[PDB]
Design a binder for this molecule. Structure first.
Ligand code: CLF
Ligand code: CLF
Ligand SMILES: [Mg+2]
Ligand SMILES: [Mg+2]
Lengths: 473, 464, 464
């Protein structure tokens, strides 16, 4: 049924956002409302639309200035917070750029301030020739025409190319709108503005993977083995100019259908490129994905050789963890997609039971997927807030929670260990090796002497201090 | 020799040193018991700052958003503020204080925060006749100042709100102390100093419990300790000791103007002299003697620093960046130990104030090497100077400058905020005698590890 | 999984882990107020040890030599002992205790130390009628044991001497505490724990003041605080708490046999469980409750370590060397934080004792990885194993191992004695809850710097 939690008695509109799956229900009657306005003052976990554009997607690129047209905070706030390495020395994580908007610019306009900042950035780093300009709350409100500024700068500086995104934080209700605006602007303005050499009979884009802890680099070892050319990665370890070539690919392989389905859908409509949805987390899922890719290209045997080798390498370790994780209860409190990517893969491959899931910004589509794959007796929460998390903990008693680090630090007080469901602990987590990495972190989080020690009150004469025995795969 | 003040020569920023005003106002607010700041603007302005505090402290702190969306950005956001206040009050029955913090968005669209507060006070009085919730308007447009100025603005607004409600009463016999933006370990050290001097004081804000235990009963103790009552009692103090010109002195000035509580602004107590002068001012205002225990702690610090100064520190060139009170204070500490702070970077538009800081003249009169003080600086200003050939032996600053030091192969000591890329720093004092000792030993230890990794006379670390 | 004990397979030593017995006896003695040890042997046996203490503590400690020369090697050295005692007594009017420490030379030649003591006692009685000087014979041949054994022997002899003179008196109500060979910071911590538990206790030896101030009056305060009267009162204690099997427990056993003071030996309090078990023992013998403040310090430690264990420590392989009580205790601490102590090195000939240590069984029943414990080890045994391909992520040990870690490019935390190549370590606790937290943090910070210098996922240090 839908659930009205005790902490929500005064915001009873939350009942429509929380589903407890029970036997025999027609799930079609219980789909949480999702992607609706946030309730003020709740300590919702949601971020803003600008985040979804610059932090999540655009900022992943290795060779592009990320010009944030706004006051300095939006830039400071999106710097030193992500884990998406590159193969060029992590340029993307080392720098952030602001137009340092001041009151004069609010009153009289910020377009000259943006122009000057763009020239400065290109002057200070003469090897960098690509830029994305993002609007933020105040620059959107005052109506600065960043597309016009960018066209002037490109006329004055023939060596550069600039893309613009209008994505103030108050747009939409969450990070999701930022995804959408970026996707649709990029296909409309930049795809089909360059071509690259095709070096394989088999070509794809990999859409919706952002190289968290090297996930894209790990997957690339599969594509290189198979002989498949990736025209563009959207956007993990990617380049701005690769993304201008996406129309060239034979196949679009999508992992994050939430952030990046938009561009896949448009590339199919405009260019005829089929969209293949996969799961690039999960051991048996990754094998299914490789088999579908290879079936599409008519390279089935190559795929079987790769899969056999990876199972021989990694399956024994995965099974070691499965034996010790079977039956443990997990909660996943992340953006959305990881819920549907992980609920059944952790169950199938590790024996782990996902008892509670919360999505900051998922759409109804993401709930359809997660409820299809998820368990009876599990809570499914759209746009969860902090008090709800405490009540859900009481209700389901997880052994581990996959969530962000600040929530991890809160639930530690309750003696519940966490794994960073966003940036990972010791990743990468995609692929065959990556699921073993995930499993290891889950095992070390749960089988941790510190948790047992923290429970002991040394003042209690009836209590001793235990010693716990661990293992390693 | 010459101490030159110069502004950043670029309009834009690369690698900002500070966050925006609202972030600093959130930091002020989280130090108050039974307080949840409400940040009126888009969601990022809240969530990214909750993350920043988790990076520095490895803890959660509660801050709420009004969740400004497109409707409110076009037609006004008053109803979001009003709804957010009520939703907080309904769901947090112990909540007492809500600083309502504006952002760029809600400054640009002109929302009337004082009006929304009147509306909310009526609504709260009607719905919760036995509670008192203090709503403080905090005007923090991000297109002025920085987190430093936002902190100061929030402290001042919250004190104005609470003391307006309670006014002056019984003299408390206590000092007010505004340390500025310091770590829990700094607050621990100040509490020890006052205890050893037999001086009763409230430290605003008391963030000692931000380093909270994992307890057997699973209780959550990660809260500010400064209460409404503590704040209200500021109007009744003997005197205010303000340790940071840019981080709370304007509240001490307000309490002097409103309540006749004399404010004594001293140099922020980085290093030996500045600590000595702070203790002298406490003894003057209170009539209490400085105790032998502090003479001993002083002496232990000097003994430790003397094992390092002429051997390892002399003539070594240092760049320092951070909050202005910290930059100027650490530059003074560096010269006590024979370091040469040749480049000081301060990160906001407050240069008209910095030029009049008496510590700049104090540096002018003790330095025998040129010093460049860049105001309105970003961290690109540091990286660009190193690229152009500035030879540094040490960087002192916060963790968002880490890649500059890493790539230039320069040892770096983490000071100020945020210090997320090392463990436990928030627990270690930087001010006072113990803090000068700890800072000096971190500097030496960073240098020692660098000599090993670079094989630069690594054999010398035996009989120093 | 197996915990295997094996001896060094070579006859000779390359890179000794410990010094000889007389050096440990000296260390014992310098913790006593108004004590100057007299080392009966050649001059190097004193001067090199005074240097070693200056390396560790960055302080001078007074130790005299009998200056054995060629004539004494042919005819015996007793006249050198007897002259040395009188020259000390004549020139140091406040001297009270002289441990007379033998060396390899004077053991080989068989000088009659107890006979020289009788001579000296008569001479001192006649020349200084109102003074009492306690001369303790300390037999410390360097060709057995190590400085660990020598420390233990010296404490015991001193205790025997002074308690023989004074005997049993009125019950003191106090605990005797033998922490073993620990830093001033460890002593500071124990004093705090006893104070918070309202337990009166003498800590033998009380070396807090080895970290002495540089004072305005130029006074020298670098002395041990344990007095004759404190040692004599040992006979009247309620109980003895011995924290180190190899570093003082035999004196607790002597006081049990002689004066019926019951001795309780506990695991040395490295890590959480061993500290918990210590505090339970204190509570049991004194009938005093463990205070809330210690529950909170424990919880703060746990919270800090939980930020580290599964993210950075799990499955990381550690080698540990140092004193036996430290090596066994640190191995237990490591396992609490998910480190894997795969190689433990203990540096002397007491293997027949170590095979019976209950902590070996405690390892055997907890570890999931093989552990090699090499006894009679030198530091070449660590280097050689690395060169043969042992993969280590961390070394924990004293500074004389530094070049092993430097050259292998393995991060190293400095623990035990001597820690001369980093600043201030003598002031930081390693035992207790605060000590566990500080050790864990040192480990992490060493790892973090290593990641930076080696560019090994250095981008990860942002949101842990
Ligand atoms: S919801 Fe998002 S992060 Fe917020 S402002 Fe808006 S685009 Fe940006 Fe920016 S400067 Fe600071 S952090 Fe805000 S108050 Fe403005
Ligand atoms: S005067 Fe010189 S240093 Fe002394 S012993 Fe003689 S040659 Fe040597 Fe050696 S082992 Fe220890 S330090 Fe001595 S007691 Fe023997
Ligand atoms: Mg000293
Ligand atoms: Mg903590």
């Amino acid at each position: 049924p839908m659930v009205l939690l005790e902490c929500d008695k005064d915001i009873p509109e939350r009942q429509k956002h929380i589903y407890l799956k029970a036997p025999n229900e027609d799930t079609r009657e219980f789909l949480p409302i999702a992607n609706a306005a946030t309730i003020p003052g709740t300590l919702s976990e949601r971020g803003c639309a600008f985040c979804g554009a610059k932090l999540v997607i655009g900022g992943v690129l290795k060779d592009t200035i990320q010009m944030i047209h706004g006051p300095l905070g939006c830039a400071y706030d999106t710097w030193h917070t992500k884990r998406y390495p590159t193969d060029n020395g992590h340029f993307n994580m080392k720098y952030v750029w602001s137009t340092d908007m001041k009151e004069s610019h609010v009153v009289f306009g910020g377009e000259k301030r943006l122009e000057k900042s763009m020239h400065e950035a290109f002057d200070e780093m003469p090897d960098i020739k690509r830029m994305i300009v993002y609007t933020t709350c105040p620059t959107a409100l005052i109506g600065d025409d960043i597309k016009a500024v960018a066209k002037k700068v490109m006329k004055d500086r023939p060596d550069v190319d600039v893309f613009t995104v209008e994505c103030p934080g108050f747009s939409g209700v969450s990070q999701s709108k930022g995804h959408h605006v970026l996707n649709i602007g990029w296909i409309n303005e930049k795809v089909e503005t360059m071509e690259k050499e095709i070096t394989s009979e088999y070509t794809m884009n990999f859409i919706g993977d952002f190289n968290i802890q090297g996930d894209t680099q790990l997957l690339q070892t599969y594509w290189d083995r198979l002989g498949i050319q990736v025209v563009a990665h959207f956007t993990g370890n990617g380049t701005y100019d690769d993304l201008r070539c996406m129309h060239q690919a034979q196949l679009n392989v999508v992992n994050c259908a939430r952030s990046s389905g938009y561009i896949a859908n448009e590339l199919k409509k405009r260019y005829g490129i089929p969209r293949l949805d996969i799961d690039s987390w999960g051991f048996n899922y990754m094998a299914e994905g490789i088999r579908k890719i290879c079936a599409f290209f008519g390279i089935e045997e190559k795929g079987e050789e790769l899969i056999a080798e990876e199972y021989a390498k990694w399956k024994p370790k995965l099974d070691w963890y499965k034996e010790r994780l079977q039956g443990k209860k997990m909660a996943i409190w992340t953006g959305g997609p990881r819920l549907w990517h992980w609920t059944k893969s952790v169950e199938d491959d590790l024996g782990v039971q996902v008892v509670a899931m919360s999505s900051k910004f998922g759409h109804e589509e993401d709930f359809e997927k997660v409820i299809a794959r998820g368990k009876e007796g599990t809570y499914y929460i759209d746009d969860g807030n902090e008090l709800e998390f405490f009540e859900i903990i009481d209700l389901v008693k997880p052994d581990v929670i996959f969530t962000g680090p600040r929530v991890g630090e809160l639930v530690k007080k309750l003696h519940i260990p966490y794994v960073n469901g966003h940036g990972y602990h010791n990743g990468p987590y995609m692929g065959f090796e990556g699921f073993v990495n995930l499993a290891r972190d889950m095992y070390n989080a749960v089988h941790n002497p510190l948790r047992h020690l923290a429970a002991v009150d040394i003042r209690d004469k009836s209590q001793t201090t235990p010693v716990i025995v661990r293992g390693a795969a | 020799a010459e101490v030159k003040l110069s502004p950043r020569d670029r309009e834009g920023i690369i690698n900002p040193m500070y966050d925006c005003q609202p972030a600093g106002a959130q930091y002020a607010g989280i130090g108050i018991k039974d307080c949840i700041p409400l940040v009126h603007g888009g969601q990022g302005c809240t969530m990214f700052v909750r993350l920043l505090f988790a990076q520095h402290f490895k803890e959660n702190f509660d801050v709420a958003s009004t969740s400004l969306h497109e409707e409110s950005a076009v037609f006004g956001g008053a109803k979001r503020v009003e709804e957010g206040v009520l939703v907080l009050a309904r769901r947090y029955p112990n909540l007492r204080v809500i600083p309502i913090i504006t952002t760029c968005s809600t400054e640009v669209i002109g929302d009337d925060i004082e009006g929304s507060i009147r509306v909310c006070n009526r609504a709260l009085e009607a719905e919760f006749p036995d509670r008192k919730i203090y709503l403080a308007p905090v005007h923090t447009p991000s297109f002025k100042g920085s987190h430093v100025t936002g902190y100061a603005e929030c402290v001042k607004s919250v004190f104005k709100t609470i003391t307006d409600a309670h006014g002056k009463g019984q003299p408390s016999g206590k000092l007010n102390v505004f340390p500025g933006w310091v770590n829990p370990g700094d607050v621990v050290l100040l509490k020890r100093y006052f205890k050893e001097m037999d001086v009763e004081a409230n430290i605003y804000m008391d963030t000692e419990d931000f380093d909270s235990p994992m307890l057997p009963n699973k209780s959550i103790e990660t809260h500010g300790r400064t209460t409404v009552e503590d704040i209200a009692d500021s109007a009744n103090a003997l005197a205010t000791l303000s340790l940071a010109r840019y981080e709370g002195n304007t509240t001490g000035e307000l309490l002097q103007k409103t309540f006749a509580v004399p404010n004594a602004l001293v140099n922020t107590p980085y290093g030996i002299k500045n600590t000595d002068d702070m203790l002298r001012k406490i003894a003057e205002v209170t009539g209490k003697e400085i105790p032998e225990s502090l003479v001993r702690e002083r002496g232990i610090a000097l003994d430790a620093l003397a094992d390092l100064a002429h051997m390892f520190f002399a003539n070594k060139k240092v760049a320092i960046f951070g909050h202005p009170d910290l930059v100027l204070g650490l530059a003074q500490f560096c010269m006590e130990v024979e370091l040469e702070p040749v480049l000081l970077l301060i990160g906001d538009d407050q240069g008209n104030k910095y030029k009049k800081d008496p510590r700049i003249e104090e540096l002018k009169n003790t330095a025998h090497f040129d010093i460049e003080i860049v105001h309105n600086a970003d961290l690109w200003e540091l990286e660009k100077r190193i690229n152009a050939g500035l030879q540094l032996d040490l960087i002192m600053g916060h963790s968002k400058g880490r890649y500059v030091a890493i790539e230039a192969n320069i040892p770096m000591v983490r000071v100020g905020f945020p210090t997320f890329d090392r463990a436990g720093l928030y627990r270690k004092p930087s001010i006072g005698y113990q803090g000068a000792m700890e800072l000096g030993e971190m500097i030496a230890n960073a240098m020692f590890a660098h000599m090993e990794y670079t094989r630069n006379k690594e054999w010398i670390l035996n009989t120093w």
